């Protein structure tokens, strides 16, 4: 019912931001829960997401509430009833602690699994005698490795046999450390890859391991493991001494928590050195006569690579085991361990290799929960196991809160925090899943997962790609799809984060969020010098793209996490962060964090370890945060309205996720004057359809073109088929022809030729070809291609310096357009802004106030030009909804005129119990932090400034009167003749008072709030009577104070 103008004045609950609400280490009371949630209502917060966080925190309650005990459950039930009563959306995390999906009700068999194996050799012309050695059952990341500085499970996978050539066995070398110490060489091939030799350090560092032989040996591959390389700083190089003193490097070895295998063109030498460029024990160092899968450990998913296409193999033209030769002996293994097999005869020089595949546990656990609530992360690739995990977990909260308080009331939502559970690469249905998703049998290729080259290096590399891709597919469907299904079956919504930070595991961070009701990302605070963490830009852009393409519309972000900056933020410091989230596509900030306040006496009290935000009822400016939250709620409202408008669908390939591709370097490829969404393989192949020359999704997302970016130079036949079909159906593609498929699917299904035909059709050579009813522009210049399609820029601007960024969001409704602009610079800008819109008279909408303002404009030639002044870091909405009566309006120029400076004496009254005197008189406005009085100097809280002032004008009726406060530390709420005229919380600190003043004498009261910083510093001073309590120390007595109070000058200004 309400108009957009009314909603903008008083945003609805759906527009109001949420907070994270950590319960710190049992420091919980019902009394505090109510005061927390009543504070959130006062301040306009729309919801909260609870965590029971088992991080070591001093006990400030009479007794800690232990997770899921009766008193804890009654506290949570109370929280749920208070959120219901107060109309706050309550969410919980998907596991005890905060991530991911794990707990002690996960049976050992259902934990995360890694592939393990034993190997045996046979003659052929012999019945295998005895027992196949059991694969390792150790919990840990690989084979026999343990987790770093007791629950276990060993499963079966299968038994494979395949012929292999008799190979030149290698002598045991002399192991010389860098110094010349003689090491136990045999321990380098030991059954214990974690236990080998300790290296001595030589001057100039360069620890090395020389392997000197008595004859030349031909080496093709090497495996190395250095225990505890845990940032994880160490490289390694393999060199060969032909003479013992001249070295030619063979290849480098990236080291990690799992072994590293490299393969190369053969080398004949009697001396091999492992050099460890930056107790150093080398657990394994093994040279191989044969060619192994180069870097198989990472390709098999035991450890991540940033870019799997970058793992360029040696060009040695070798071919390994013939896949057709591989035999499945799974049948023949008996529980006894014996194998009943008649090994068929082989050519001479060729023996049998029998591979016994099994699985064992990673052992990773949910965090941070108490031991009783800590247990295995559920197998993320097994939908049934995930469902059992989550149905049980939800059952616990229905018991705790009561079933009436889970679903439509009380607990409304589930949060899947960003995932980091280690590197799992097996799940029991894997062979069926691989067959169904990739279209061919993985069984003949499994030996590649253990290092054994199958077919050509390229075929094994493509199989491993296909294997990694199946794991990524199952993560999205079997974990995140199941989580959303179970939540929905229980009337819950899902807030869903993904990778967030570079590439912690396999998976696509759009697909991982495509099933969630609210795709979610994160943004940390950052110094303006340094800029944001790039991975978090990609994280948010991915999440926004999901919501646009799959129709969720809502885009959440874990907002404004801060590290080692105790209580050092007022809204003036935060605006640029939330504006960056807004302009990237976030429209539901979830503030990190609002720690639960269990007792009132300790101020500012508990914090989530070393992290901020510190946004709870103990914050110094907490009772004046409503205008800040209103700013976020008003911005979110407009940024949820209608649909996102974007012209470019940026296809980023089938390899690394967005936080991987752009974890360090931002996308350099994207348009500037046009908006864009990322599209992944699923979006490309399932959502996009032709609409004339456009590509549309069921959500209403609508694009002029697909851009081939990211890793799309490697493209699968399945993707290419869909792309060709959309082109032929009328769509435009901008990009250069892919150079290869990364997958074996098309070769295995016999579709060799078709990939090349489709490339030849879409990229015939001209570089700009009509293809069916569509068009392929063979360019990597997106804006020049859009120009050649006659697509005008959506937003652009003149009149600013070079390098000035004013990024934008474009929203669209049946009622008109909304552009969101952010001047990402401290310097004010005066621009002419060009919008691709017509027929509408623009207005500026200000989220600070909820008011709209008319603006001059000219409509002409398919665009509207608007002259804009933007303060430093100003964010503003340019709204095109009113039908334009005229095509040009030039508003009368408005001048500014200082009318008076409110200099002279002020009364100041200080919030009680804050170490300050009740009141002072200032002959002159002065920064309180420069005061001679320590109780004023170090004051944190609300100082109330008081004064009268004379007005000799009539205002409102065509002439306005502004109060400019000058410098303010840090925000100020202003009352004129008892009337609240607003609160100024960022520069320029200016408020419209024309309506509240009267002729003659007027009363003025200005409530200035600052941060806790100064009172914290004040408490470190020698002799200090301590006002504050925090868990750990925050500032040294050295620390520079923040400017505090009403600094001014305070001026009356007429238009
Ligand atoms: Na996160």
Q: What percent of the residues sit in helical stretches (DSSP H or I)?
A: 10-25%
- Provide the gyration radius in Å: 33 Å
Q: What ligands can be seen in this structure?
A: sodium ion
Count of individual beta strands: 58
Strand portion: 25-35%
How many separate domains make up the residues? 6
- The global form is globular
Strand order of the largest sheet: 1-2-3-19-20-21-22-23
Distance separating the two termini? 36 Å
Keywords: Hydrolase, Plasmid
Protein name: Glycoside hydrolase family protein
PDB class: hydrolase
Keywords: rhamnosidase, RHA-P, glycosyl hydrolase, hydrolase
List the defining traits of the structure above.
7-stranded antiparallel beta sheet; alpha+beta; binds sodium ion; 1055 residues; monomer; Jelly Rolls
Structure, explained:
This is Glycoside hydrolase family protein. Keywords: Hydrolase, Plasmid. By secondary structure, this protein is an alpha+beta fold. It folds into 6 domains: 1-89 and 520-528 and 561-641, no CATH class; 110-167 and 297-370 and 424-491, no CATH class; 174-289, Jelly Rolls (Sandwich); 645-788, Rossmann fold (3-Layer(aba) Sandwich); 799-889, Sandwich (Immunoglobulin-like), CATH 2.60.40; 897-1054, Galactose-binding domain-like (Jelly Rolls, Sandwich). It is built from 18 helices and 58 strands. The strands form 13 sheets. It has an 8-stranded parallel barrel, surrounded by 5 helices. Strands 7, 8, 10, 11, 12, 13 and 15 form a 7-stranded antiparallel sheet that branches. It has a 6-stranded antiparallel sheet with strand order 26-37-38-44-40-41. Strand 21 (518-524), helix 8 (534-550) and strand 22 (556-563) form a beta-alpha-beta unit. Helix 3 packs across helix 5 and helix 13 runs parallel beside helix 15 (752-762). It binds sodium ion (NA). Sodium ion binds at residues 417-418, 497, 500, 522, 558. Sodium ion (NA) binds at residues 417-418, 497, 500, 522, 558.
């Amino acid at each position: 019912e309400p108009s957009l103008e009314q909603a903008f004045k008083d945003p609805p609950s759906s527009a109001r931001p949420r907070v994270w609400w950590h319960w710190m280490n049992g420091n919980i009371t019902k009394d505090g829960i109510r005061k927390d949630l009543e504070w959130m209502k006062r301040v306009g917060i729309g919801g909260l997401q609870n965590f029971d966080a088992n991080l070591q925190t001093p006990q400030i309650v009479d007794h800690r509430l232990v997770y899921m005990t009766p008193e804890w459950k009654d506290a949570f039930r109370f929280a749920a009833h208070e959120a219901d009563r107060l109309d706050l959306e309550l969410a919980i995390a998907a596991s005890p602690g905060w991530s991911e999906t794990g707990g002690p009700w996960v049976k050992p068999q259902d934990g995360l699994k890694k592939l393990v194996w034993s190997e045996t050799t046979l003659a052929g012309g012999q019945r295998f005698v005895g027992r196949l050695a059991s694969p390792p059952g150790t919990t840990g990341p690989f084979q026999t490795l343990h987790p770093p500085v007791g629950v276990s499970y060993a499963g079966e996978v299968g038994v494979l046999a395949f012929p292999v050539p008799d190979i030149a066995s290698l002598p045991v070398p002399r192991a010389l450390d860098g110094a010349g110490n003689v090491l136990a060489g045999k321990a380098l091939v030991d059954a214990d890859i974690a236990g080998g030799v300790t290296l001595a350090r030589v001057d100039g560092k360069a620890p090395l391991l020389r392997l000197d032989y008595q004859r030349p040996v031909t080496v093709r591959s090497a495996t190395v493991f250095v225990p505890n390389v845990r940032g994880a700083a160490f490289a390694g190089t393999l060199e060969s001494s032909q003479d013992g003193k001249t070295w030619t490097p063979i290849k480098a070895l990236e080291l990690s928590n799992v072994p590293t295998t490299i393969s190369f063109a053969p080398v004949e030498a009697a001396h091999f050195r492992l050099v460890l460029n930056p107790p150093i024990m080398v657990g394994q160092f093994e040279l191989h006569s044969d060619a192994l899968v180069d870097r198989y450990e990472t390709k098999a998913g035991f450890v991540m690579s940033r870019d799997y296409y970058a793992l360029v193999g040696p060009h040695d033209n070798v071919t390994g085991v013939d896949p057709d030769s591989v035999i499945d002996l799974t049948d023949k293994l008996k529980a006894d361990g014996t194998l009943d097999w008649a090994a068929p005869k082989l050519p001479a020089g060729q023996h049998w290799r029998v591979l016994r595949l099994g699985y064992s546990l990673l052992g990773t656990t949910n965090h941070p929960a108490p031991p009783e609530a800590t247990g295995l992360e559920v197998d993320k690739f097994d939908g049934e196991a995930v469902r059992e995990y989550l149905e049980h977990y939800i059952g616990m909260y229905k018991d705790a809160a009561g079933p009436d308080m889970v679903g439509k009331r009380g607990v409304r939502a589930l949060l899947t925090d960003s995932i980091e559970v280690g590197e799992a690469n097996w799940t029991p249905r894997m062979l069926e899943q691989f067959q169904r998703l990739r279209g061919y049998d993985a069984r003949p290729w499994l030996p590649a997962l253990t290092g054994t080259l199958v077919g050509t290096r390229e075929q094994s590399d493509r199989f491993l790609y296909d294997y990694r891709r199946t794991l990524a597919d199952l993560l999205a469907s079997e974990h995140y799809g199941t989580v959303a299904d179970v939540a929905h079956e229980n009337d819950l919504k899902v807030y869903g984060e993904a990778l967030e930070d570079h590439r912690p595991m396999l998976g696509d961070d759009m697909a991982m969020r495509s099933h969630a009701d609210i795709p979610m990302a994160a943004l940390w605070t950052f110094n303006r010098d340094e800029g944001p963490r790039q991975t978090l830009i990609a994280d948010m852009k991915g999440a926004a793209s999901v919501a646009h393409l799959y129709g969720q519309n809502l885009v959440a972000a874990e907002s404004m996490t801060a590290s080692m900056a105790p209580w050092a933020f007022a809204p003036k410091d935060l605006k640029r962060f939330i504006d960056l989230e807004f302009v990237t596509g976030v429209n539901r900030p979830v503030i990190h964090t609002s720690v639960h306040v269990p007792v009132d006496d300790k101020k500012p009290g508990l914090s989530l370890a070393i992290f901020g935000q510190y946004f709870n009822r103990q914050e110094s400016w907490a009772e004046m945060a409503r205008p800040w939250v209103d700013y976020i709620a008003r911005s979110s409202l407009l940024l949820q309205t209608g649909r996102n408008v974007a012209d470019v669908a940026y296809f980023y390939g089938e390899e690394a996720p967005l936080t991987g591709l752009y974890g360090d370097e931002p996308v350099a490829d994207a348009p500037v004057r046009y908006a864009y969404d990322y599209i992944n393989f699923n979006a490309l192949t399932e959502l996009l359809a032709n609409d004339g020359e456009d590509l549309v999704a069921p959500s209403g997302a609508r694009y002029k073109t697909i851009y081939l970016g990211g890793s799309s130079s490697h493209m699968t036949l399945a993707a290419l088929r869909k792309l060709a079909a959309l082109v032929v159906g009328g769509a435009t593609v901008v990009g250069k022809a892919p150079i290869a498929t990364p997958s074996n699917t098309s070769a295995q299904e016999g579709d060799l030729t078709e990939w090349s035909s489709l490339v030849a059709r879409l990229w015939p050579g001209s570089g700009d070809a009509r293809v069916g009813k569509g068009r392929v522009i063979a360019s990597q210049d997106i804006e020049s291609a859009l120009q050649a399609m006659d697509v005008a820029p959506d937003f652009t601007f003149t009149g600013a310096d070079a390098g000035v960024k004013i990024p934008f969001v474009h929203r669209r409704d049946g009622k008109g357009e909304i552009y969101y602009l952010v001047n990402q610079q401290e310097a004010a800008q005066s621009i002419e802004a060009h919008f691709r819109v017509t027929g509408k008279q623009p207005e500026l909408w200000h989220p600070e106030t909820g008011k709209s303002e008319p603006i001059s404009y000219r409509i002409s030639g398919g665009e509207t030009v608007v002259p804009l002044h933007l303060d430093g870091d100003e964010a503003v909405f340019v709204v095109f909804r009113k039908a334009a009566a005229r095509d040009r309006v030039t508003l009368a120029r408005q001048g500014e005129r200082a009318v008076a400076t409110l200099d002279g004496a002020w009364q100041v009254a200080f919030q009680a119990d804050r170490g300050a005197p009740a009141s002072i008189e200032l002959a002159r406005l002065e920064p309180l932090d420069k005061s001679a009085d320590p109780g004023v100097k170090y004051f944190s809280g609300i100082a109330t400034y008081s004064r009268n002032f004379r007005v000799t004008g009539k205002y409102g009726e065509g002439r306005s009167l502004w109060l400019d406060l000058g410098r303010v530390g840090d925000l100020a709420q202003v009352s004129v003749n008892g009337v609240d005229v607003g609160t100024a919380w960022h520069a320029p600190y200016r408020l419209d008072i024309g309506k509240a003043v009267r002729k003659g004498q007027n009363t003025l009261e200005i409530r200035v709030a600052n941060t806790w910083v100064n009172r914290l510093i004040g408490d470190q001073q020698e002799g200090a009577q301590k006002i504050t309590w925090t868990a750990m120390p925050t500032y040294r007595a050295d620390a520079p104070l923040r400017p505090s109070g009403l600094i001014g000058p305070v001026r009356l200004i007429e238009e």
